[PDB]
Short mmCIF file of the C-alpha atoms (twelve columns), coordinates in Angstrom:
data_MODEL
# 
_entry.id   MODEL 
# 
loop_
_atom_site.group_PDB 
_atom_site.id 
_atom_site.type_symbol 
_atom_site.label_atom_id 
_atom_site.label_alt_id 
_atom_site.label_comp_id 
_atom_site.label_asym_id 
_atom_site.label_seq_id 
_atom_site.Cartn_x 
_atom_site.Cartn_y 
_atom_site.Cartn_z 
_atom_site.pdbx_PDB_model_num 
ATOM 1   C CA . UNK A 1   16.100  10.285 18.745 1 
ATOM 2   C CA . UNK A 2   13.593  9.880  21.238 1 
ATOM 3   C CA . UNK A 3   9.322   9.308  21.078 1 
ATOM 4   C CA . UNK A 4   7.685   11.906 20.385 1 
ATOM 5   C CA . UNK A 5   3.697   11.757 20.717 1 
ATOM 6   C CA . UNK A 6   1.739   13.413 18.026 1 
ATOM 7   C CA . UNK A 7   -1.994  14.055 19.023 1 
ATOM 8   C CA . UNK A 8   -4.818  12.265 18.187 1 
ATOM 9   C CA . UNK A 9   -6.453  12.976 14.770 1 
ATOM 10  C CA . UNK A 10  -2.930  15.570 14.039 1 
ATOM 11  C CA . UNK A 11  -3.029  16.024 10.309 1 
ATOM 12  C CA . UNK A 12  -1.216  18.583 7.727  1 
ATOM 13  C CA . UNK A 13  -3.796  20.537 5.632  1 
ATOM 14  C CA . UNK A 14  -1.576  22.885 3.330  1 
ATOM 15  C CA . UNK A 15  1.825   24.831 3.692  1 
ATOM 16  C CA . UNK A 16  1.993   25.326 7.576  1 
ATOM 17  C CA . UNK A 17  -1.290  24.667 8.277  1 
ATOM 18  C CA . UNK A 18  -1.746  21.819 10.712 1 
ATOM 19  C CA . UNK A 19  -5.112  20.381 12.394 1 
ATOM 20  C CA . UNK A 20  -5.118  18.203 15.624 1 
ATOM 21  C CA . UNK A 21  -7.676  17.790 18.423 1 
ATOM 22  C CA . UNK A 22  -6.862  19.189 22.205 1 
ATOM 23  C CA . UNK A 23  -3.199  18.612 22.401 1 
ATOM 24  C CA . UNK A 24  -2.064  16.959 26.014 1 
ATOM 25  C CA . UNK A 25  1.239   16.776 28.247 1 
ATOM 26  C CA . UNK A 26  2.915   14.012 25.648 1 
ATOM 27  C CA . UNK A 27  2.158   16.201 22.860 1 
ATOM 28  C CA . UNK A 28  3.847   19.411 23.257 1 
ATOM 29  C CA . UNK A 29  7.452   17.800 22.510 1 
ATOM 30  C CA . UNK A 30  5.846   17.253 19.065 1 
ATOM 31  C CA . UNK A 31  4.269   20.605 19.161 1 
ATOM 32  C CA . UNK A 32  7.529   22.231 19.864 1 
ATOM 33  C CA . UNK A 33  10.808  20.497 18.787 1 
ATOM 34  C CA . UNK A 34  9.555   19.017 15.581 1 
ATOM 35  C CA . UNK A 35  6.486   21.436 14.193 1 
ATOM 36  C CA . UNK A 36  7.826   24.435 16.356 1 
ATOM 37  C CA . UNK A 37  4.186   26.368 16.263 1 
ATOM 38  C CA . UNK A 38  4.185   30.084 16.121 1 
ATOM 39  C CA . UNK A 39  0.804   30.382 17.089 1 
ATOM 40  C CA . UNK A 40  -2.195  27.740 17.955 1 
ATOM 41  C CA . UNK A 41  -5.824  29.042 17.178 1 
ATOM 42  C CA . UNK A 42  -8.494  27.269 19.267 1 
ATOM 43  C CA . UNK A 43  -12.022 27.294 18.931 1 
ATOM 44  C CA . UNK A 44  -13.598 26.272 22.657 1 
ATOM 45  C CA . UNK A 45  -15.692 28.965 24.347 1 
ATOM 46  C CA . UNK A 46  -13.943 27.777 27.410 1 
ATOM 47  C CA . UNK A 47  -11.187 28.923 29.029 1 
ATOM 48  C CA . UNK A 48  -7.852  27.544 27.967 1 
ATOM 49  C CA . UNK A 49  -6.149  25.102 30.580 1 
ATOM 50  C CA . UNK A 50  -3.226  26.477 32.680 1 
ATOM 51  C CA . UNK A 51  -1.004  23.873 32.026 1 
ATOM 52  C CA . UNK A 52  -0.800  24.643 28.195 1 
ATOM 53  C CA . UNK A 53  -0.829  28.219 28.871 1 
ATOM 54  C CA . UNK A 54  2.277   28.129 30.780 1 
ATOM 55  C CA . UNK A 55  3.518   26.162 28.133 1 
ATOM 56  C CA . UNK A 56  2.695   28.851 25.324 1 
ATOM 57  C CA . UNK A 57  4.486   30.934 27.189 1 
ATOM 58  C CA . UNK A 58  7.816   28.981 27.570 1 
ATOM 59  C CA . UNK A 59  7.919   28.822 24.077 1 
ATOM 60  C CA . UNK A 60  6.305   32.027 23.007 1 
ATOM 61  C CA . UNK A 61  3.359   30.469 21.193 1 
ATOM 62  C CA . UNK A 62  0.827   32.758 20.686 1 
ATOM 63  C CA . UNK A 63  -2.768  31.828 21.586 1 
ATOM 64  C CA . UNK A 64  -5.404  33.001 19.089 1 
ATOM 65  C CA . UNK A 65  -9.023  32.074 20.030 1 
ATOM 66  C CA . UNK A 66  -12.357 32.155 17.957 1 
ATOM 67  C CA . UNK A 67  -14.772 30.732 20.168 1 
ATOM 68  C CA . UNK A 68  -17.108 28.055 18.257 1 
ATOM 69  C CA . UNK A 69  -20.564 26.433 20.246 1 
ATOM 70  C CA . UNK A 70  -20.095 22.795 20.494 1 
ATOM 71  C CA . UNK A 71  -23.912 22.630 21.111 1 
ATOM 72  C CA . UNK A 72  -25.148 25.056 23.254 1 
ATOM 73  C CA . UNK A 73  -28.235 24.562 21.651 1 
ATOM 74  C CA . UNK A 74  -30.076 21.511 19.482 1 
ATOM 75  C CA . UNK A 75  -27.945 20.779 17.151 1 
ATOM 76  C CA . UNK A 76  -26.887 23.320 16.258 1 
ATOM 77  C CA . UNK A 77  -25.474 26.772 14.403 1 
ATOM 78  C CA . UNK A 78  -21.962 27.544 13.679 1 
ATOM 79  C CA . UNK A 79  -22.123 31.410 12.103 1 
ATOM 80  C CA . UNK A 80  -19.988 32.335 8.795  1 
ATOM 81  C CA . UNK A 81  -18.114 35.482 10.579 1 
ATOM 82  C CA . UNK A 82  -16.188 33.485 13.163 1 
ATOM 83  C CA . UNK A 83  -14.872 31.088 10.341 1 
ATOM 84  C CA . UNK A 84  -14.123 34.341 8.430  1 
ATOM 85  C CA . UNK A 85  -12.039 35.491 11.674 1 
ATOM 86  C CA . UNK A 86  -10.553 32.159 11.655 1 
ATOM 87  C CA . UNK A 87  -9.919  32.298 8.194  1 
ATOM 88  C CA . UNK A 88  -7.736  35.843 8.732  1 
ATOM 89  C CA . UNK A 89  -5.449  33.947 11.277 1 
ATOM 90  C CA . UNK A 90  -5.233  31.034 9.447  1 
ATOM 91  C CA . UNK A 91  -4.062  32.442 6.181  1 
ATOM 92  C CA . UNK A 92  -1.962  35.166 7.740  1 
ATOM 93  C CA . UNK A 93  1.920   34.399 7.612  1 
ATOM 94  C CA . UNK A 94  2.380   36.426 10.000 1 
ATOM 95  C CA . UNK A 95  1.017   33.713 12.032 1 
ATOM 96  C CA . UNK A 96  2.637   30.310 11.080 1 
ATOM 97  C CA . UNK A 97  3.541   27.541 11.339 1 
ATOM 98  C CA . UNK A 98  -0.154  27.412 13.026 1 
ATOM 99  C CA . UNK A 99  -2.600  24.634 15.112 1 
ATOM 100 C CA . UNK A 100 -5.773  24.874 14.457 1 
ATOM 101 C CA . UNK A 101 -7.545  22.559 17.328 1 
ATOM 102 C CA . UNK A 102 -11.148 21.938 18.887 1 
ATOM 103 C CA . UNK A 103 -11.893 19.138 21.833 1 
ATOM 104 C CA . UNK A 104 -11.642 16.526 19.742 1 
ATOM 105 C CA . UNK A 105 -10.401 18.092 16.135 1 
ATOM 106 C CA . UNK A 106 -12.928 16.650 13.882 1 
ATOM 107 C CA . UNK A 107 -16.035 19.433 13.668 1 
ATOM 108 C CA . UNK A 108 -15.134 22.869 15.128 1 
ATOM 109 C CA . UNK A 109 -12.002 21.874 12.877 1 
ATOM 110 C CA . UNK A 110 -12.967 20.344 9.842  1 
ATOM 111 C CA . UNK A 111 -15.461 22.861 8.798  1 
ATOM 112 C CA . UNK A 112 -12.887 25.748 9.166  1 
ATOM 113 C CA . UNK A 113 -10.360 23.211 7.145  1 
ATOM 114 C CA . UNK A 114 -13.448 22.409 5.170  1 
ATOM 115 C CA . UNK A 115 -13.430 26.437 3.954  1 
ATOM 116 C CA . UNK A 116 -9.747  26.514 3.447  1 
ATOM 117 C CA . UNK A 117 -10.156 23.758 1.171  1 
ATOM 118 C CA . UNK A 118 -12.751 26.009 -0.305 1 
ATOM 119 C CA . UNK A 119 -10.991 28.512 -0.688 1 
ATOM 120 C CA . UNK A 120 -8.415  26.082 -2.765 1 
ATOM 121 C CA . UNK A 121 -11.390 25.368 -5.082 1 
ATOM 122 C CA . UNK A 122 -11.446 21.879 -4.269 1 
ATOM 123 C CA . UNK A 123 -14.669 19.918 -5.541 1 
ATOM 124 C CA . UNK A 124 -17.318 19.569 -2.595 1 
ATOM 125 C CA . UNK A 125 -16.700 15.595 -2.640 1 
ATOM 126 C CA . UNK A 126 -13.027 15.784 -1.699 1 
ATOM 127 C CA . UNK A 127 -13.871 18.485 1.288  1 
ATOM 128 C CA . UNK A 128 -17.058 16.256 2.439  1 
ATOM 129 C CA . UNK A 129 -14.441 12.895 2.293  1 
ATOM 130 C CA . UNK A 130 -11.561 14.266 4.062  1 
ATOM 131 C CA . UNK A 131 -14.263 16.067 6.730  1 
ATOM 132 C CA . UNK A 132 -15.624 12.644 6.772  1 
ATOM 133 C CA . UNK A 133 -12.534 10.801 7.268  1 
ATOM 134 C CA . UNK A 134 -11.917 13.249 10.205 1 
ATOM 135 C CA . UNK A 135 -14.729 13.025 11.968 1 
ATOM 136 C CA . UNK A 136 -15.627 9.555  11.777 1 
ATOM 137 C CA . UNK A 137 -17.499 7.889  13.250 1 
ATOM 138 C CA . UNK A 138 -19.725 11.068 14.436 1 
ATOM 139 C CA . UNK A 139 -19.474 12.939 11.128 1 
ATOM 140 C CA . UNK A 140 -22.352 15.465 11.139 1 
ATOM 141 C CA . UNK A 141 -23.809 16.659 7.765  1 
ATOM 142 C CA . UNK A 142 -24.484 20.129 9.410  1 
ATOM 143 C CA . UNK A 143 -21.101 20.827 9.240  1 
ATOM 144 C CA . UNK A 144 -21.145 19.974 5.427  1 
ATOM 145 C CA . UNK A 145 -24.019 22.582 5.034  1 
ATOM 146 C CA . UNK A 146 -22.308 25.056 7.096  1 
ATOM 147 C CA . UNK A 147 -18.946 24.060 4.552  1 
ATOM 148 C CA . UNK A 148 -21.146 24.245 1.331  1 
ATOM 149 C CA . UNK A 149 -23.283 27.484 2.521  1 
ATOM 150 C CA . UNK A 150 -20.114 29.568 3.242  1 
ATOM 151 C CA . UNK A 151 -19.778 32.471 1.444  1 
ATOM 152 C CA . UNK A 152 -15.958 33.682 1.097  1 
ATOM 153 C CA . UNK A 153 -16.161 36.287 -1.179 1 
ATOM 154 C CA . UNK A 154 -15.352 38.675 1.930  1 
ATOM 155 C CA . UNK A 155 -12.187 36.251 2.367  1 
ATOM 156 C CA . UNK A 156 -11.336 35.922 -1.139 1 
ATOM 157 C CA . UNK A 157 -10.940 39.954 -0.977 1 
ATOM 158 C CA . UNK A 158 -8.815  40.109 1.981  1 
ATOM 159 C CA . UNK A 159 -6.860  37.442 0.659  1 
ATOM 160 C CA . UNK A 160 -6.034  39.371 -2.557 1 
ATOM 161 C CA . UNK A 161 -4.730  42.388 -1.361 1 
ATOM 162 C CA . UNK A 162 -3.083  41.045 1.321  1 
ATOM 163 C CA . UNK A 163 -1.557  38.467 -1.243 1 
ATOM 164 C CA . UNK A 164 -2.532  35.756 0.687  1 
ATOM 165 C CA . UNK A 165 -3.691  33.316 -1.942 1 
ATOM 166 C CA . UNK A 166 -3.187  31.293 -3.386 1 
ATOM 167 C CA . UNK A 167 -2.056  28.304 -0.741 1 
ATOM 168 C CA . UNK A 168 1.529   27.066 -1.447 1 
ATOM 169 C CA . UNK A 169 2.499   23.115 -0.697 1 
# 
């Protein structure tokens, strides 16, 4: 019966699919004793910190990365194929209860959560509000286009014979 720290912008998305942004030190009690995470997919191009790796390792938390540009470039490109890899460790049970993260969990995250929530055939307006309520106050509208321009067809595939979908609450 003691505090437990949840990260910052930590959110449930469907089943055992969680979203958060970089968990810290206070956060892994949350991560462990009360989600308890099989794996954590991350989508920095940099190199994971040692502190959390040592912790995925003293709780055998597997550490799946898909490595996503922040910028990189002008503002920017985010390409359909790693979401589709995303998408195959995301929806594999194999794989959860599972953290999907980025530095701050609102646009590396939200546009993968954004094509899970396609894949759900949610209306674009409820994706674009809950991407919005994410990633306020620096919501970018590239990120919609990149949600509304994804074509999952390749997903939907994998998804059926693997009997993946549909998403269960």
């Amino acid at each position: 019966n003691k505090e437990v720290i949840p990260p910052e912008n930590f959110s449930h998305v469907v089943g055992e699919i969680y979203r958060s942004s970089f968990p810290r030190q206070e956060n892994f009690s949350f991560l462990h004793e009360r989600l308890k995470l099989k794996s954590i997919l991350v989508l920095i191009p940099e190199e994971y910190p040692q502190e959390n790796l040592n912790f995925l390792k003293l709780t055998g938390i597997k550490l799946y990365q898909v490595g996503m540009s922040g910028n990189k470039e002008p503002f920017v490109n985010i390409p359909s194929h790693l979401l589709t890899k995303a998408l195959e460790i995301v929806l594999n049970p194999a794989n959860q209860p599972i953290l999907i993260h980025s530095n701050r969990g609102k646009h590396r995250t939200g546009c993968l959560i954004g094509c899970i929530r396609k894949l759900q055939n949610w209306s674009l307006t409820m994706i674009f509000d809950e991407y919005r309520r994410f990633a306020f106050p620096k919501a970018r509208a590239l990120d919609q286009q990149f949600i509304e321009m994804y074509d999952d067809d390749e997903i939907k595939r994998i998804a059926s014979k693997n009997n993946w979908l549909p998403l269960q609450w």
